[PDB]
């Protein structure tokens, strides 16, 4: 199964103030997105 994760919703959610200082941790979510995108693309290459 191919899954995607929204970092902002999972960590903070509907708290607006939480999201603001979450950016101070850097580009952590960007790495997570790229890793999951790589997994999802490979799943279609397997079936091919």
């Amino acid at each position: 199964t191919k899954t995607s994760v929204d970092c902002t919703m999972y960590i903070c959610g509907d708290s607006t103030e939480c999201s603001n200082l979450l950016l101070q941790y850097g580009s952590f979510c960007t790495q997570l997105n790229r890793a999951l995108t790589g997994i999802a693309v490979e799943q279609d290459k397997n079936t091919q």
Partner: protein, 48 residues
């Protein structure tokens, strides 16, 4: 516009053919609602 958001994510001024995942979207709230009990009185805590 959507094209420019792709450039910023890719950190480049040119975009190769394909499909890219840029951001997430959320439905903004309509307004605010406060529901509180309807009893109304004065609390006798000043007597303490």
């Amino acid at each position: 516009d959507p094209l420019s958001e792709t450039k910023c994510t890719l950190k480049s001024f040119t975009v190769e053919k394909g499909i890219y995942q840029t951001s997430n979207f959320r439905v903004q709230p309509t307004e605010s609602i406060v529901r509180f009990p309807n009893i109304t009185n004065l609390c006798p805590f000043g007597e303490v």
